[PDB]
Structure formats: structure tokens, C-alpha cells
């Protein structure tokens, strides 16, 4: 059997993530302070009689500083008040900000609120145009729209326009935020990443500045650092234990990639144990993934893929060798996981990953079947099975394992393709259709997503390209009414959706791979995040 050419890069990192001992003495004395700044802010969030406009700057300013997670109480308080207050009267920058921040928080304010700022065509008013710090926020808030908020239709478009055509004169650090929203909005970034810039580009150059929450943010943001670097180094020995890099080295070693891509889903030190499950479902998934696409038979991934339905180590002598590591190692991860969960009493929740990493594994088989076949079915039936392939109903699933509240009734949600989970799962398809598509016409995939939008619909690649980001920004829509209350789970389990939704929109900005390809894109954030501390 001669396999195909193997020509994913290495790691980038060598073993420079594997050891990471944390100082005891740094640590103590970061919480210890962080302490006395914690309520230093709080009562900053507490105080009386503060402006509107005064408060919605506070609440913005912690959250991109990346210190609300300490803070969701008192946020909400004071966002339902506002919510319920509706005192309708402010310039173009307070209520964007409110629209945003309301939106985000899952109150459902109407978008009626801009009216004011529109002609009599739902068109904003031009002479808007020179308030830079409302084109800011109108454009920060556009990104937050449902399907009934066509009454913002325009705000992107406008907003655009003239923040580029402000940019260049702006003074700074304003300039560097205006161009970084423009390249990236806050509401569709990796959290950690945006406030990484945030914290340091723009909040430690302002001279406007508030101390206690620039310190704050700086040393919650390297104390959390120092947690994500012993989980990396934790996973790092995990990985090199299994040695995939050496018995399996067709596949692509990411696993520092893969904990972004979990770091990007919760960094919130509560979810530690949830982090580090996830990532190695991340990891092991992407393994089996470069099995099917750059390496296996079609008779060997028959094989593979019945060994998975039947999941049992008995199978593993119906297997080529190079399988059965792979094989056992699944088995092995999933027996750790009911393990670890044990305690909690929460082992049982872990059949819920297995049986959507069958429906991946099962419809990886049927993407090879119609590769082998040559088959290019219609978008409808390619959606059927290309949705599951992204694994992003699997991850979703993982996600919940660690998560120390989540219950059999979230589970039972999630198993349902609820509405949010669908949308983030086409976000991931159609721009991963998009990107990949030339790379994967070479290499004679004529079932790929555009290539079937083609010849189904009869259309250009270019109008294939076009109505695939219709779906992505109709999943967006659809992603932001899934965040309203009420909620039919709690905000805690939609989050890591939207999350995913972010990581794709992340990884592969300006239309490449990233994950394959992690140098451009996922380098520079995996070394702000997890390599060079902030400088205070
Ligand atoms: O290279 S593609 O195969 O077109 C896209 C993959 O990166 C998708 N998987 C890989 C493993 O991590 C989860 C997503
Ligand atoms: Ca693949
Ligand atoms: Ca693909």
C-alpha cells in the first residue's frame, strides 16, 4: 500500500511548552493584591449616582480589560436596570454602547434607539460623520444584530466608511483602536486575544487611564497565564506520552494550536478541568481526521470507521497496526474521562461525547466513500453530512464534560442541534469552505462544499463564495437571538457556542488555515497569550 505524501510542517514550539514550573511566591503575591483590587472595583461598580454614559464606559472598560468574569453579578444588576429603565434620550455613542452591551447580555433592547439617528429611509444621517467615537461604537454594535434589527442594515456599511476615512488623524492610542475594530470587531474576537491587545496597545496608552484597573487587568491576566501554562504543560507531557509525533507522523501536531482553540472556548479559571478535557478530544479528533483524509485506505477507514460504531477493544485485531494506536488511545482518553468525572458522580455524562464522535467518525467515512466515488452530491445532502465533519457538534459536546454545573438537561438539549449550535456548526463549514476550497480543488476533492454550491445551483465560484457568506452571516443572526432571554439554558452553556463561532472567525481571518498553517495567524495570539507576559 503506497500512502500518500506526508507534508504538514512540524510543530513550531519543540518542547518549549512541556516543563513550566509555576512561582509560588509571584502567584501569592499577584492574588493577594488582585484581592484589594477586586473590591477597589467593585465599589467603583456600586457607586451611586453615576452618569449613564459614565456607567456603560465602566462596564466596557472591564469587560475588554478581561475582568468582568469577576464581576457578572453586579454587571447584570445594573444592565437590567437599564434595560427596564428605558430612558430613551442619548447621543450616538452612549446608545450604541447600551444597544451592545444589553445585546450581549442577552436583554433584548429594541433597536428602535437609533431611530433618532436615521433619515426617514432607515439611512443613517451623514451628519454622524465626524463623530468618531459614535462611528466606533455604531460599528461595534452593527456586529450584534438579530434578524429583526434590519433597521441597522446600514450601520456597518456607514460606520466603516468613515472610521477609515477618520483613521489616519486620529490621535493615538484611538488611531491603533479604530484600525484594530476594523480589522477585527470586539464582538466576533477570541476573548483573551482582544483583551491582550486591549490591555496593552490601548488601555496602557491612554492618558485618560484609571490605575486600579490597569494594574487589575494586568496581573489577573498574567496570574491566569501562569494557570494556562501549567494546563499546556500538563497536556504537553500528555501528549508526548502518546507519541503521535513519532508511530503516527502522517498527522498534523497541534496541540498547542488545539489548546488555543480550547483556551478560546472558556479562560476562566473555574474551568481548568473543562479546558484540558476539551483539548485533548481536540487534539485526538484531528488524529483521527488526517487518518481518513491524508493516509488510510478506503478499505482500511471502512475497518476503522465500524471499530468506532462498536467502540470496544476487541475490535482493535480487525485493524491495521498504525489504527490500533490510534484506536486505543480514543478508548483510553474516554476511560480517563468517566475517571476523572467520577468524584463528581458525573461519569455517565460522558456517552454524550462518545456518540458524536461516532456521528463524526461515520460521516468522515461517507466523505471519503464519496471522494473514492467521485461523487458530488447537492448542497442539501452535502450539508447533511459536511455539518457533523467540522466536529463542532462534538466539541460543543466535549466542552460541557469539565464543566462542573452542566446536567443530563443540558445534554438533552444540546443532543437536539439546538438553534445556536447549528449556527456556530455553519459559521465553521461555510468559512472553512471558503478558505479551503482552491487548496482541496487541487488535490481532487469534487465534493467540496463550493465546488458542490456550483454545480447545483449552476452558479460562479465567485457567486458560490458569495452565497456561502450569506450563511455565515445568517448563522450570526442567528447566533445573537440565541444569546436573548430567556435562554433555554442557562448563559453559561450558550457561551462556549458563541465561542466556537469565534475561534473560527479567528483562525482563519483573511482566509487561510490557520490550524494547518498556525504560523500567520495563531503564532503571534499563542505567543501573547501562553509565551510573553504583560509588562507592567
Ligand atoms: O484541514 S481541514 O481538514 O479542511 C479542517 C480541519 O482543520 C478541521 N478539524 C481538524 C481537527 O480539529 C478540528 C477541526
Ligand atoms: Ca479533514
Ligand atoms: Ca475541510
Known amino acids: 500500500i503506497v500512502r500518500p505524501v506526508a507534508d504538514f510542517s512540524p510543530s513550531l514550539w519543540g518542547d518549549q511548552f512541556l516543563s513550566f514550573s509555576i512561582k509560588n511566591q509571584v502567584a501569592e503575591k499577584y492574588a493577594k493584591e488582585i484581592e484589594a483590587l477586586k473590591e477597589q472595583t467593585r465599589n467603583m461598580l456600586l457607586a451611586t449616582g453615576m452618569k449613564l454614559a459614565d456607567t456603560l464606559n ?113 490621535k493615538s492610542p484611538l488611531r491603533e483602536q479604530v484600525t484594530h475594530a476594523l480589522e477585527q470587531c470586539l464582538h466576533k474576537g477570541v476573548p483573551r486575544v482582544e483583551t491582550r491587545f486591549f490591555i496593552s496597545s490601548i488601555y496602557d496608552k491612554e492618558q485618560s487611564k484609571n490605575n486600579v484597573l490597569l494594574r487589575f487587568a494586568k496581573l489577573d491576566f498574567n496570574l491566569l497565564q501562569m494557570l494556562h501554562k501549567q494546563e499546556l504543560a500538563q497536556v504537553s ?14 498527522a498534523r501536531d497541534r496541540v498547542v494550536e488545539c489548546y488555543f482553540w480550547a483556551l478560546g472556548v472558556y479562560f476562566e479559571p473555574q474551568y481548568s478541568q473543562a479546558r484540558v478535557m476539551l483539548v485533548k478530544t481536540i487534539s485526538m479528533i484531528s488524529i483521527v481526521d488526517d487518518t481518513f483524509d491524508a493516509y488510510g485506505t478506503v478499505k482500511e477507514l471502512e475497518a476503522y470507521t465500524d471499530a468506532i460504531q462498536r467502540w470496544d477493544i476487541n ?64 448542497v442539501s445532502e452535502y450539508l447533511s453530512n459536511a455539518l457533523a465533519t467540522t466536529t463542532y457538534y462534538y466539541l460543543a459536546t466535549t466542552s460541557y464534560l469539565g464543566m462542573k454545573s452542566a446536567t443530563e438537561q443540558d445534554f438533552e438539549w444540546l443532543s437536539k442541534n439546538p438553534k445556536i449550535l447549528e449556527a456556530s456548526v455553519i459559521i465553521c463549514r461555510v468559512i472553512d469552505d471558503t478558505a479551503t476550497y482552491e487548496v482541496e480543488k487541487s488535490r481532487g ?86 509565551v510573553d507576559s504583560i509588562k507592567i
Not at 333 to 361: F, N, P, Q, T, W
Open 58 to 170: 465602566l462596564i466596557d472598560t472591564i469587560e475588554r480589560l478581561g475582568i468582568s468574569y469577576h464581576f457578572e453579578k453586579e454587571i447584570d444588576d445594573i444592565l437590567d436596570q437599564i434595560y427596564n429603565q428605558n430612558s430613551n434620550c442619548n447621543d450616538l455613542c452612549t446608545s450604541a454602547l447600551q444597544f451592545r452591551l444589553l445585546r450581549q447580555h442577552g436583554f433584548n433592547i429594541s433597536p428602535e434607539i437609533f431611530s433618532k439617528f436615521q433619515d426617514e429611509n432607515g439611512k443613517f444621517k451623514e451628519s454622524l460623520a465626524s463623530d468618531v467615537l459614535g462611528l466606533l461604537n455604531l460599528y461595534e454594535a452593527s456586529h450584534v444584530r438579530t434578524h429583526a434589527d434590519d433597521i441597522l442594515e446600514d450601520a456597518l456599511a456607514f460606520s466603516t466608511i468613515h472610521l477609515e476615512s477618520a483613521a489616519p488623524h486620529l
Open 237 to 250: 507531557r500528555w501528549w508526548k506520552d502518546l507519541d503521535f509525533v513519532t508511530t503516527l507522523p502522517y
Open 315 to 378: 475490535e482493535i485485531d480487525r485493524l491495521p497496526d498504525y489504527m490500533k494506536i490510534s484506536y486505543k488511545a480514543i478508548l483510553d482518553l474516554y476511560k480517563d474521562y468517566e475517571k476523572e468525572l467520577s468524584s463528581a458522580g458525573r461519569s455517565h455524562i460522558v456517552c454524550h461525547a462518545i456518540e458524536r464522535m461516532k456521528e463524526v467518525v461515520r460521516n468522515y467515512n461517507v466523505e471519503s466513500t464519496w471522494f473514492i466515488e467521485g461523487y458530488t452530491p447537492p
Open 445 to 530: 476533492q469534487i465534493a467540496t462544499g463550493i465546488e458542490c454550491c456550483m454545480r447545483d445551483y449552476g452558479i460562479s465560484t465567485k457567486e458560490a463564495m458569495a452565497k456561502f457568506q450569506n450563511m455565515a452571516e445568517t448563522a450570526w443572526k442567528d447566533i445573537n437571538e440565541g444569546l436573548l432571554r430567556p435562554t433555554p439554558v442557562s448563559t453559561e452553556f450558550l457561551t462556549p457556542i458563541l465561542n466556537l463561532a469565534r475561534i473560527v472567525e479567528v483562525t482563519y481571518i483573511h482566509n487561510l488555515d490557520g490550524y494547518t498553517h498556525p504560523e500567520k495567524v495563531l503564532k503571534p495570539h499563542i505567543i501573547n497569550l501562553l
